[PDB]
Design a protein around this nucleic acid. Structure first.
Ligand code: CL
Ligand code: CL
Ligand code: MN
Ligand code: MN
Ligand code: MN
Ligand code: MN
Ligand code: MN
Ligand code: MN
Ligand code: MN
Ligand code: MN
Ligand code: MN
Ligand code: MN
Ligand code: MN
Lengths: 77, 110, 96, 91, 93, 105, 84, 99
DNA sequence: ATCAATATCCACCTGCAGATTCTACCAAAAGTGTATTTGGAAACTGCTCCATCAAAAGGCATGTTCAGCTGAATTCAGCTGAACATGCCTTTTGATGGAGCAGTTTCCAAATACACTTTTGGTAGAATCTGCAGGTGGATATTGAT
DNA sequence: ATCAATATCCACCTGCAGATTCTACCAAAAGTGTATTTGGAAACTGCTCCATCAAAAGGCATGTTCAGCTGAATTCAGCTGAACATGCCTTTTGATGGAGCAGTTTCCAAATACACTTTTGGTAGAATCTGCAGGTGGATATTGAT
């Protein structure tokens, strides 16, 4: 499913980052990075979720996971 | 016993808009075992919060009127915060829907 | 037939996506990825849509910032093309 | 019934820009911001009280928290506004 | 006056894992800082968990979730095992 | 006759003391269950044992009896999980040797 | 009543900076590094010390303790082990 | 009979191995104490310090500078140099989120 | 580097779907009055450390010479990545049930708190016990001039 | 491609700084009894997600062409390292007052507790208001020909 993060989507992200020219190896590399990132946040989110004995991951669970990893997010509280 | 003195909220007595009583209760619920909260502590907290809210709303409303629109958006909040040295240092959180402040490094322009 | 020279459309894209704020990843593949990842942690998980949306805002802000740092590393080496060694240097200095 | 800071944020907005409104998503961001700063100040005030082996969080703890957590000029102005508020509240 | 520390317990554990080894006072100071650090991380996250789920008691359940949150991978698995063992042995009395 | 809670839990770390400390760092009117202190003690004891195991290994591969800050640093920075858990400065611990390949003569 | 303290950032000598770079695995050092390093160090120290003194003044002491420095370092994300 | 000379860089690498194998502090101790007091007294006059506070400050400063040099060296090598330059420090600190 | 040709960007427009704001009710929270307690400030004072000064020798900083070799500057080809036409499929969008969790209320057995009392595990400082820092010298490895 | 010079590696050594034990008390852990709280089991109930189904457009996959950027190659001036003379200031330990933390006791200003009243903030629907989808026309920018 990681391949659903397509090359044009990665390029748009790089463009918002001010990147002008992109090596062909970037896309696979970026997917790897994203995968790690996502795992960590999700690992903590579901942890909060099983502590509450729920079966639905809430926005609050995600926000707490991101704050606990030093990546606070505003606007979903 | 005909007349009571009119009730004045602690917010109004301190000249604040932010809710002193509510903040006092939250402060008591963040204190340790046997913890106390002083009379003026919630008033000070309320004033700090109101001041910082006023600063970001000021800058974001400036960006809002300099874009010929009524409502402050996440975009305006992000522009205001990232464009202010102190606010940018105080607020490192992600502002969802705010994007980035436009910038292209000089060596990339044709 | 008209042709832009290599780099003109790229810079146009930079200005376009830096003045906008919408999400840049398609929603269904990202939601599919989120659920696949979550299923190696707890079975029959459900998600509020706002949980998926918060995750996508976080991931996209993270990747944009990473690309800013990667670009600084590429520029440092007197290049304009970002390469994996640029990502790797940025992530090492970040402590990732 | 969920609490929020929206009505007070809107009051402050109408004070600084009487003509301007705010979108609900920006109001959500302001709420996250207010809650964030509040738990930073409370955490540090509680820690200050405990380092010096006290149980009361007083406005003095809040002031030192503000000096610790806020950058430079902001901290100065914040310390002023808080002091002003307290002086008007006790009068 | 009497300032408490974790030194005697650190030394007992040392003798359990390396019966032959000692420890310098500055390394003991590092160990004391480490134990206090991990204790405040656990206690902070356990009180937060209690408040998110609106319980007023910090129970072993809050401690276990805190450990899963704060510890990497294998460390967490093994820590959860030791904690569970201690709790079941304490209640068996 | 008094039986220590540490002994009751089969631990070396002090369960009662840790209970008092937990009780003095939770929210106002907060209560702490006994087994919360037993679990916390077990966690701290396990992490101490893990760090000490690695540090004594480094100490014994350097032919000395006593663990020093240096051995703690070699032990923590040499294990990826401990390294990621402990970001603090180890006073007196120095650095793990490393010279990048492009610098050697 | 001590002698006036002036210009002590220059006491971070070029050999001391070089030894630090060496522990950092650095083999060759431009001549401009030393001043740059002094600048960086000074900012770092200012920030840490500014917080330590804040803790000291809150406690109504006139002695900066090791705990105050430890708390200031923790508040700046540079936790230190071995002094409290 | 010519006097012995090591080639440029041989002693540098020897110094790297020496100071990476050791743990002593590398800044002289009294000049660092003077620096700490000069800075602290421009915040509040006639402060005193415990000896351990000054030593904790020095451990932190030296750990910070060693780390900064590790990253700066990564930046210099990244640009195919062996010499660290100010732009390397500035790039490291920018990516660190400092300044 | 001024043209003529071509392409994109960026204001401005309207009409209406939907977002903001307004309005009214009502649990819950804030405020008041009154009584009662208590954390910590103030004032002592003992007594640690802290600031400063002192001595003297050598470890180390400084300033200089000189040349190896690094960074910087320049050229350029091949090979990668940008741009674009084309055409196909994944995502998007809109709708519909209903399955299955959350959220809420109630309610005791079970858990935790707290005063008082007994008892000992844990600490400070002294007294013992002993690694290991440095000091020294010979084997081995590395280095740089021939 | 054989050595002299110099460093490194690696045993061996001992005295005293520091690691470990011993000693005497006492702060706090544990036991008991009694009071108070609460976690969670039980039983509901709308309302969010999930599953399914469907059409179609725009966003993506692909293949082609070529421009230009990256990496390699080459030259060289001057910058930084290595080595050394010189001499100062850092290091280590002790003294000396005394500043200022700690420890202790007392007593209010300041905080909590509790009953009751007043007020407010959240919610949902109505009433307003506004950005936004597209479309257009002019501003601006790029590209190739001289
Ligand atoms: Cl690469
Ligand atoms: Cl530079
Ligand atoms: Mn001064
Ligand atoms: Mn009484
Ligand atoms: Mn009292
Ligand atoms: Mn000299
Ligand atoms: Mn070169
Ligand atoms: Mn070509
Ligand atoms: Mn005993
Ligand atoms: Mn030795
Ligand atoms: Mn109202
Ligand atoms: Mn309009
Ligand atoms: Mn449009």
């Amino acid at each position: 499913n990681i391949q659903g993060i397509t090359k044009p989507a990665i390029r748009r992200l790089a463009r918002r980052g001010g990147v002008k020219r992109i090596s062909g190896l970037i896309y696979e590399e970026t997917r790897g990075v994203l995968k790690v990132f996502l795992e960590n946040v999700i690992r903590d989110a579901v942890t909060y979720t099983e502590h509450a004995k729920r079966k639905t991951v809430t926005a609050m669970d995600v926000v707490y996971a991101l704050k606990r990893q030093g990546r606070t997010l505003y606007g979903f509280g | 016993g005909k007349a009571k003195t009119k009730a004045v909220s602690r917010s109004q007595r301190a000249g604040l808009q932010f809710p002193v009583g509510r903040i006092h209760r939250h402060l008591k619920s963040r204190t340790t075992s046997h913890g106390r909260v002083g009379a003026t502590a919630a008033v000070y907290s309320a004033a700090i919060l109101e001041y910082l809210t006023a600063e970001v709303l000021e800058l974001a409303g400036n960006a809002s009127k300099d874009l010929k629109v009524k409502c402050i958006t996440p975009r305006h909040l992000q522009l205001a915060i990232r464009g202010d040295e102190e606010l940018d240092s105080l607020i490192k959180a992600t502002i969802a829907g705010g994007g980035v402040i436009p910038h292209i490094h000089k060596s990339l322009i044709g | 037939p008209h042709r832009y020279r290599p780099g003109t459309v790229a810079l146009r894209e930079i200005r376009r996506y830096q003045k906008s704020t919408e999400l840049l990843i398609r929603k269904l593949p990202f939601q599919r990825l989120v659920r696949e990842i979550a299923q190696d942690f707890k079975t029959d998980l459900r998600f509020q849509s706002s949980a998926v949306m918060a995750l996508q805002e976080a991931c996209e802000a993270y990747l944009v910032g990473l690309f800013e740092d990667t670009n600084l590393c590429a520029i440092h080496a007197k290049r304009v093309t970002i390469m994996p060694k640029d990502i790797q240097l940025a992530r090492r200095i970040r402590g990732e | 019934r969920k609490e929020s800071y929206s009505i007070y944020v809107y009051k402050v907005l109408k004070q600084v820009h009487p003509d301007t409104g705010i979108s609900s998503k920006a109001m959500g961001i302001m709420n996250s911001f207010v809650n964030d700063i509040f738990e930073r100040i409370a955490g540090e005030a509680s820690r200050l009280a405990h380092y010096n082996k006290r149980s009361t969080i007083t406005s003095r703890e809040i002031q030192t928290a503000v000096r610790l957590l806020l950058p430079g000029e902001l901290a100065k102005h914040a310390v002023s506004e808080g002091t002003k508020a307290v002086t008007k509240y006790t009068s």
